[PDB]
Design a protein around this ligand. Structure first.
Ligand SMILES: [Mn+2]
Ligand SMILES: [Mn+2]
Ligand SMILES: [Mn+2]
Ligand SMILES: [Mn+2]
Lengths: 372, 371
């Protein structure tokens, strides 16, 4: 399908994003759910999918990790099924992501869907990331509190919650409504009628993850192999001392390495292009030869990107799922990065180059793009 | 005994250290060996001690590792035995380290001893570390090359090398010292039965700094702050990552690194650790603080465990991967400055109970022993 967002973007980015939560009423007009609770359940039965059941009985909370062989015995009440990264396994669901391209592809994460019977829900909780929560069929009561430091507690080892909060937002969401929550704002919501919620999640790294990742990149690629050297080595009163100048030199090594021109860009390119959830990956059973891709495309057949596969451009280099793609043909690479559903027109003269055709062949044979 | 290096130190550090290799003729006058070859073999058989044995049947070599038994077996000619960190074990060998205190404690590693029967040698190897090779008990032929300078390929470190043209070729007598910087290919082998005492040095490369610091960051779970973009910049293509964003991220990292306390503490814990296993046997019954106090004021002498690294950063003291929590700058400064302390070395600090409780804990860790 194709989904149309009624949001006013400049106003939102200016006043709201990464600042304050909002309820965007009728974000989607005449909202038609991309998927059904049944299709979602069947999808949760699959073993490659990350899914979980969260139920609560009076005070007690029970969290069960999927997949599942059974719809019984659950209840008419007080439970919810959560499925991560549906946009990987379902194309119509993947369509929901497109309207959010007004925000950077690299910051966006994936689409997680929850189905809840009345009373069903995940409880009050905090996130470290921005989220858009889209109301599907049914209705839920959503509550968001002010952003204040609060202790996280665990009703279950597998389930994070906070203490109940005074809501700065308390509302019932109709289908098509969207609730934007910046990180740090406690929120809770629960089904009134049988409900479907679509969370477009976002991702941002912290410093720990960055320095760790890059350290592993340096180790793996065997970089930064230059040793500390002191032909000028300074005198000292006490031989057990390590002088401030030496510490400074030592750290200056790390800073210098971090600032080496290609290395950081390349590492981050390989990192950020990787998905936090498992892709659906099925390399073409026989591999493709370059000229049947050439032919297929020229024959009118269309190339489409695997749902959830991240393609990002940093400078003149492109990165698809951890792998750097480097080609002299810019329009083609731009076509690969900024739109799914590619046709020969988007490639231009690139297909004539056997090198580009070879690369493209390797990308398709990898499962990253497939024919329609 | 207690060794006196005859060396012009200003001239060495100025013209030589980390620059050019030299043969220092009669680096030691009347050089008596700290240890006998059979004693060395006595250590070569041990569970904890790191040894190795290298033999060349011409054109081909064989290497075995410790512990050891039955040296016959075989060999008369053409083999060598090598033992790491002998100063961690044999106390008079650690005294051979004292003259090199003219160089920083943090850059010094340890002393390895190699006994080679005639023809015995390790082959033309290469190091990324500085080394002083002290000749004793017999003679060896040493040759040192010109340090070739492999574009963008990692240096293999200790991996073996080419039959170089020698900028240095000679035969060492007892007391002779061959200093080599990192990068200079070198080979040596025994003529008469030969003892070599190689005092080595250690430097971190950038990779080790970044890995260590990263691990430390994970452990204390620091840098928890998340990248945020209230102002997030517009772009032509939704798939693009702008330079200003890359700068945001990079500066997050640089900021974490330039936080002084964390880097300081981590490195203090990192550099105070030893590259080889120490001898650690805490007193079977411990000492009460009063026992320490008393015995210490009886004129007894505490000595730092051989090979144990104690280093000062700012005013902070680190002993074997751990900080020492304490005031009394003179006393801790003494703990780092002198191996073999006395009551006079501490002075006033002994009357503070909180101080000697700590010190007693140091002794009980096995980091200092009486003699
Ligand atoms: Mn309840
Ligand atoms: Mn072109
Ligand atoms: Mn000199
Ligand atoms: Mn060497």
């Amino acid at each position: 399908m194709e989904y149309q967002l009624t949001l006013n973007w400049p106003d939102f980015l200016e006043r709201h994003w990464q600042k304050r939560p909002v309820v965007l009423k009728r974000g989607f007009n005449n909202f038609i759910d991309p998927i059904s609770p049944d299709e979602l359940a069947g999808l949760a039965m699959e073993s490659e999918v990350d899914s979980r059941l969260v139920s609560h009985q009076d005070g007690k909370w029970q969290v069960s990790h999927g997949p599942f062989e059974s719809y019984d015995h659950l209840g008419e009440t007080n439970w919810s099924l959560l499925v991560q990264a549906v946009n990987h396994w379902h194309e119509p669901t993947a369509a929901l992501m497109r309207p959010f391209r007004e925000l950077p592809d690299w910051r966006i994460d994936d689409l997680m869907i929850s189905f809840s019977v009345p009373g069903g829900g995940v409880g009050p909780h905090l996130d470290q990331y921005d989220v858009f929560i889209i109301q599907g069929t049914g209705r839920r009561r959503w509550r968001v509190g002010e952003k204040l430091q609060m202790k996280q507690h665990c009703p279950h080892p597998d389930l994070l919650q906070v203490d109940p909060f005074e809501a700065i937002i308390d509302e019932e969401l109709e289908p098509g409504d969207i609730l934007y929550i910046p990180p740090g704002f406690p929120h809770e919501g629960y089904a009134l009628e049988n409900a479907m919620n679509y969370s477009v999640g976002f991702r941002a790294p912290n410093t720990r993850e960055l320095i760790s990742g890059f350290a592993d990149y340096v180790l793996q690629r065997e970089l930064g192999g230059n040793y500390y050297s002191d032909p000028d080595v300074p005198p000292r009163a006490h031989p057990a001392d390590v002088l401030p100048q030496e510490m400074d030199k030592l750290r200056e090594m790390m800073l210098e390495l971090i600032n080496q021109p290609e290395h950081f860009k390349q590492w981050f390119g390989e990192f950020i292009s990787q998905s936090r959830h498992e892709l659906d990956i099925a390399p073409p059973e026989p591999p493709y030869q370059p000229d049947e891709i050439y032919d297929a495309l020229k024959q009118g057949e269309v190339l489409v990107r695997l749902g959830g596969l991240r393609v990002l451009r940093i400078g003149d280099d492109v990165y698809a799922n951890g792998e750097k793609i480097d080609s002299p043909h810019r329009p083609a690479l731009d076509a690969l990065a900024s739109n799914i559903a590619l046709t020969a027109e988007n490639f231009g003269d690139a297909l004539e180059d056997p090198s580009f055709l070879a690369m493209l062949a390797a990308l398709v044979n990898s499962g990253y793009w497939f024919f329609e």
